[PDB]
Amino acid sequence: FLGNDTVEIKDGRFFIDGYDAIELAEKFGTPLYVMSEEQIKINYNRYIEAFKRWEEETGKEFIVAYAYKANANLAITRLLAKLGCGADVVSGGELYIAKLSNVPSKKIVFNGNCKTKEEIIMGIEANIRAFNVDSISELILINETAKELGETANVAFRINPNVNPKTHPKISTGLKKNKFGLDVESGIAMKAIKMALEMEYVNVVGVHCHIGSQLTDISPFIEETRKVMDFVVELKEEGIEIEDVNLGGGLGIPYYKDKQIPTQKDLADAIINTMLKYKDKVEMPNLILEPGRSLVATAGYLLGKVHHIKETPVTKWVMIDAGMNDMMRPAMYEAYHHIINCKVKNEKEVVSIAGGLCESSDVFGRDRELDKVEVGDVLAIFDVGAYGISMANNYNARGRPRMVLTSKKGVFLIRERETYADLIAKDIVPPHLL
Amino acid sequence: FLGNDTVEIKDGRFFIDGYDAIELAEKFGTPLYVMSEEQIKINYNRYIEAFKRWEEETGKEFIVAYAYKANANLAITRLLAKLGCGADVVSGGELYIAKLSNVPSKKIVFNGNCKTKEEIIMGIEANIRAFNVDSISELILINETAKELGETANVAFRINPNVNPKTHPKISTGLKKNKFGLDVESGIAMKAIKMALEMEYVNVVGVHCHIGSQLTDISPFIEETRKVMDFVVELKEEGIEIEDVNLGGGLGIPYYKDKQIPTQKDLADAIINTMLKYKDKVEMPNLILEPGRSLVATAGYLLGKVHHIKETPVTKWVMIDAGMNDMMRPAMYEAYHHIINCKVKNEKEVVSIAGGLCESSDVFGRDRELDKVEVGDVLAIFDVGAYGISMANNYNARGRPRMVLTSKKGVFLIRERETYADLIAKDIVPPHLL
Numbered sequence: 001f002l003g004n005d006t007v008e009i010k011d012g013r014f015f016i017d018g019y020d021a022i023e024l025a026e027k028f029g030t031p032l033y034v035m036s037e038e039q040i041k042i043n044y045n046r047y048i049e050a051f052k053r054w055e056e057e058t059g060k061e062f063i064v065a066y067a068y069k070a071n072a073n074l075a076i077t078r079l080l081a082k083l084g085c086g087a088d089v090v091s092g093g094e095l096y097i098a099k100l101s102n103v104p105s106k107k108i109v110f111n112g113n114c115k116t117k118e119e120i121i122m123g124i125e126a127n128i129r130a131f132n133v134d135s136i137s138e139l140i141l142i143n144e145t146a147k148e149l150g151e152t153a154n155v156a157f158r159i160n161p162n163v164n165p166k167t168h169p170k171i172s173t174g175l176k177k178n179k180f181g182l183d184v185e186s187g188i189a190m191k192a193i194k195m196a197l198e199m200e201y202v203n204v205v206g207v208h209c210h211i212g213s214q215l216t217d218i219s220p221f222i223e224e225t226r227k228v229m230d231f232v233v234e235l236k237e238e239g240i241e242i243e244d245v246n247l248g249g250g251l252g253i254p255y256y257k258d259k260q261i262p263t264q265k266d267l268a269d270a271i272i273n274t275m276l277k278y279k280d281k282v283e284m285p286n287l288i289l290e291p292g293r294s295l296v297a298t299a300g301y302l303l304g305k306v307h308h309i310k311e312t313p314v315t316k317w318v319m320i321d322a323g324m325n326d327m328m329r330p331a332m333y334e335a336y337h338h339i340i341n342c343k344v345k346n347e348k349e350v351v352s353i354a355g356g357l358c359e360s361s362d363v364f365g366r367d368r369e370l371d372k373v374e375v376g377d378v379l380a381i382f383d384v385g386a387y388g389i390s391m392a393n394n395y396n397a398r399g400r401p402r403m404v405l406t407s408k409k410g411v412f413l414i415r416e417r418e419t420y421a422d423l424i425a426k427d428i429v430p431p432h433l434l
Numbered sequence: 435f436l437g438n439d440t441v442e443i444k445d446g447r448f449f450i451d452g453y454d455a456i457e458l459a460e461k462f463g464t465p466l467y468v469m470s471e472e473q474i475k476i477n478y479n480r481y482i483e484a485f486k487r488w489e490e491e492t493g494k495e496f497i498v499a500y501a502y503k504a505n506a507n508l509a510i511t512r513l514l515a516k517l518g519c520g521a522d523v524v525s526g527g528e529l530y531i532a533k534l535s536n537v538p539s540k541k542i543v544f545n546g547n548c549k550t551k552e553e554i555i556m557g558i559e560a561n562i563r564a565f566n567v568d569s570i571s572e573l574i575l576i577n578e579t580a581k582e583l584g585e586t587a588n589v590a591f592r593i594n595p596n597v598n599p600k601t602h603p604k605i606s607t608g609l610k611k612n613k614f615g616l617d618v619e620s621g622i623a624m625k626a627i628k629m630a631l632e633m634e635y636v637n638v639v640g641v642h643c644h645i646g647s648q649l650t651d652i653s654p655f656i657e658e659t660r661k662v663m664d665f666v667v668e669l670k671e672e673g674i675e676i677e678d679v680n681l682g683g684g685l686g687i688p689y690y691k692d693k694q695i696p697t698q699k700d701l702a703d704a705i706i707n708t709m710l711k712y713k714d715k716v717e718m719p720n721l722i723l724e725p726g727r728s729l730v731a732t733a734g735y736l737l738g739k740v741h742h743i744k745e746t747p748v749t750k751w752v753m754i755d756a757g758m759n760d761m762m763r764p765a766m767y768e769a770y771h772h773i774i775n776c777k778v779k780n781e782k783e784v785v786s787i788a789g790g791l792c793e794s795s796d797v798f799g800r801d802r803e804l805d806k807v808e809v810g811d812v813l814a815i816f817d818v819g820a821y822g823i824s825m826a827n828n829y830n831a832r833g834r835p836r837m838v839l840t841s842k843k844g845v846f847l848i849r850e851r852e853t854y855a856d857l858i859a860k861d862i863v864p865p866h867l868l
C-alpha cells in the first residue's frame with residue numbers, strides 16, 4: 001500500500017496499473033516480475049518536484065543519476081532515459097547499457113573502486129560528465145589513459161567527509177572501514193584533487209560522496225551534506241572551485257507498510273537548506289544525487305504460483321515457483337518484503353512462504369498472515385524493482401524469470417525467461433570428456 | 435595447503451596441476467575460475483575408497499550422488515559422470531544436465547520442497563532412482579502424475595530425525611523450523627510412507643535425510659545415521675522394507691588451513707559402524723550419500739588481477755578484477771577463503787582484498803598476509819569450486835567469468851565469459867520506448 005501508488009484491489013483481486021495480476025501470471029507464466037511504468041514516473045517526478053527549488057535559488061542544475069546497479073534492464077533504463085533522467089554507472093556494462101539507452105553523456109557519472117583501463121577508455125571516448133575518482137591510483141590511470149587517447153577526462157572525487165563518530169556512529173564507520181573514497185581528514189582527498197589540478201589530461205568538475213543505503217532518516221543526509229560542503233569551502237580556501245556536488249543515493253523505501261518514512265521532499269529540504277548555508281563561502285554548484293532503490297523498488301512485484309501446501313507441527317508452508325535465485329533479497333539479508341494473495345478470501349491464515357531451492361535460507365516470509373492460500377493461487381511480493389532481477393542468478397540450475405512492463409500502452413514482455421539450453425549456453429565440454 | 439593436493443609453489447610461482455597460474459591468467463584473462471580435474475578425481479576416489487568396505491560387508495551398493503547445486507558446469511558433471519559418480523538434482527535443469535552428462539538414471543535422486551508437475555514428469559520419464567519426497571503433498575502429486583502417464587515413480591522419503599536441541603543446537607533447530615522433510619517425531623514421516631504403500635503408482639525405494647552443510651564434526655553424522663536407522667527399524671516392524679538409505683551431504687572442507695577436519699574415512703567409519711549395528715533387526719540396504727562441497731570445493735581457484743593499490747590511513751587495499759558477482763561466498767556469508775599472491779615476493783605485507791563492485795560487502799578478505807602485492811600481480815583465492823560459479827551473477831552489470839579445466843591432457847576452456855551483448859541478451863525494449 002504505502003509506496004505502491006499504482007496497485008489496487010478490484011472485486012477481491014490484485015491489480016497493477018489496472019491489470020489483473022492473476023491473469024498476468026496466467027498469461028506470462030510464473031515466476032514473473034511485473035514492473036510498473038507509471039510507478040517509475042511517479043518516483044522520478046517526486047524527485048524533480050521536490051528539488052526544483054534548487055534551480056531557482058541558485059540558477060544551477062539538479063541532476064538525478066539513476067543507480068543502474070538497482071535494475072539495469074534495457075526497457076527500464078530506456079524508460080528512465082526518456083524521462084530525461086541521468087545515470088549512475090559503476091562498470092563497463094552499465095556505461096554500455098546507459099549509452100545504448102540513449103542517456104546523454106552530460107548526465108552520466110562513473111563510480112567504482114576498481115576501474116580498469118578498458119572501462120576508463122570507454123568513459124573518456126563517451127565523454128561522460130564525470131569520473132567519480134576513488135583513489136590516486138585511479139587518477140593516475142585516467143590521466144595517463146586520456147593522454148593516450150588525446151582527450152580530456154572529467155573527474156569528480158569520492159570523498160569520505162569528517163563525519164562526527166558520536167552523532168552518526170554507523171555513517172562514520174562505514175566511511176572509514178570500507179574500500180571507497182578518499183579520506184578527507186588525513187589530507188588524501190586534498191592531495192588527490194591538488195594532484196589532478198596539475199595534470200594536463202583531467203578536468204576537475206566536482207566532489208562526490210555516498211553514505212549508505214536504505215537510510216530512513218534525514219539526519220545522516222544533513223550531516224553528509226554539511227561535512228561535504230565544509231570540504232568545498234576548504235577547497236575554495238586553497239583556490240579550488242567545485243562545479244558539481246554529488247551526494248550519492250541511499251534513500252530508504254517503504255518496505256514496511258505500517259510506519260511512515262522520509263520522502264523525497266523531506267530529503268530535498270534537508271539538503272537544499274544545508275547547502276544554502278554556504279551560499280556565501282562558495283558558489284552554489286550543480287547538485288547531483290544517485291538514487292537507485294528510491295526510483296524502481298516500489299515499481300516491481302514478483303508473482304509466484306503456489307504448487308504445494310505443506311503442514312508441519314509448528315509451521316504451515318506455502319511453496320511457490322519463485323525462489324531466491326529470482327529475488328535474492330530475503331535469503332541474503334533476511335530483509336522484509338510485503339507478501340499477499342492476489343485473491344481475497346473470506347478467511348485469514350498465518351503461513352510461511354518459501355521457494356523451491358534446496359537452501360534453507362530460501363524463504364520469502366515467515367509467519368505472514370494472508371488470505372487462505374490454496375494450491376494454484378498466485379502470491380505477490382512487493383518492492384522487488386530494485387536489487388531484484390539485478391541480483392538474480394541460476395543457483396540450483398534455475399533460469400532467471402520473465403519480466404513484463406505494465407503501462408497505459410499495455411503490458412509488454414521486457415525480459416524473456418531462460419530455458420534449460422540457456423543454463424548451459426556458456427559451458428564447453430573438453431575433447432577428452434566428450 | 436590442506437585439501438589442495440594438486441597445487442604447489444615452484445620457482446617463486448604458484449602452480450595448479452603443474453600449470454603456471456600467472457600464465458593461465460595471461461592466456462585466458464581475468465577474472466578466471468580454474469578447476470583441477472585431478473583434484474576432483476582425488477576427492478571422489480577418497481569417498482569410493484573410504485566406503486568400499488560397505489559392499490564388501492553387505493554385498494549392497496554404495497552410491498555417491500554428487501549434489502549438482504554446488505557446481506553444475508557441463509564439463510564438471512561430464513567428468514564426474516565418467517568417474518561413475520551419481521547425481522543429486524533438485525531442479526528440472528539439474529536433471530536435464532545430469533541426463534545430458536550421461537549419468538545413469540539408477541544413480542540419480544531428486545530432492546526439493548517444491549517439485550512441479552513438469553519436473554515430476556521429467557523425473558518419471560527418465561525413470562530416476564528416486565524422488566526424495568519432501569511432503570505428503572508431493573507424494574500425491576507424484577502418484578497422480580505417474581498415474582496420468584501410465585508409469586510408476588520410484589520414491590524415497592526425506593525425513594527429519596528428532597535431533598536433540600542440546601547436543602547440536604543448529605542441526606536441531608533446522609530440522610524443525612525449516613521447510614524440508616517429513617517430521618519423524620510428530621508421526622508425519624510414518625504417515626507419508628504408510629500412505630505411499632497404498633498408492634498404486636509409486637514404488638517405495640527408501641528413506642533420505644540431509645542435516646546441513648560444511649560440517650566439520652563427525653558426531654552429527656553418527657546421530658543422523660542412528661536416528662535414521664531407528665526409523666527404518668520402526669518401518670520394519672510395520673512390515674515395510676527399505677531398499678536404499680540416503681544420508682545426504684554436509685561434510686565440510688578445509689577453508690581454514692589452520693584447523694584439522696574429518697576425512698571421508700572418518701565419515702565412512704562413523705556411518706558404516708553405526709549402520710552395521712542394525713544388521714540383526716533389518717537387512718542392510720544400499721547406502722547413498724550426496725556430497726557436494728566435499729567433491730568440488732578444493733578443486734576450484736579464482737584468479738583475479740590487481741588493477742589498483744589504495745592506501746588508506748588504516749588499511750592498505752588491493753583491488754582486483756574478480757568481484758562478488760563472480761564468487762558470492764565472502765560477501766554473502768562473510769566466510770573465509772585462503773588468498774595468496776601467485777608470485778612469491780621476498781617480503782610480505784598485510785592488505786585487504788576487494789572486488790570492483792560498488793557494494794561495501796564486496797570484499798574477499800581483510801588484513802591478510804600476502805607476498806608484496808604489486809599492480810599487475812595475480813591473486814588466487816582457494817576453494818571456490820563449490821557454490822562459486824553456481825551462485826555467480828551479473829550484479830553491477832558484469833558478466834560471469836571464464837572457467838578453465840586443468841588436467842593431464844592440458845588446460846581447456848569449460849565456460850566462456852559473458853560480453854556486454856550477453857548482459858542484455860534477454861532484454862526487450864517495447865515500441866513506445868524505442
Ligand SMILES: O=C(O)CCCCCCCC(=O)O
Nearest residue numbers: 212213329335387792793794
Ligand atoms: O552502501 C553500499 O554501497 C552498500 C549497500 C547497497 C545496497 C545493496 C542491496 C540491498 C537490499 O537487498 O536491501
Ligand SMILES: O=C(O)CCCCCCCC(=O)O
Nearest residue numbers: 358359360646647648767821
Ligand atoms: O542446508 C542446506 O540446504 C544448504 C547450505 C549451503 C551454503 C553454501 C555456502 C556457504 C558456506 O560454506 O556455509
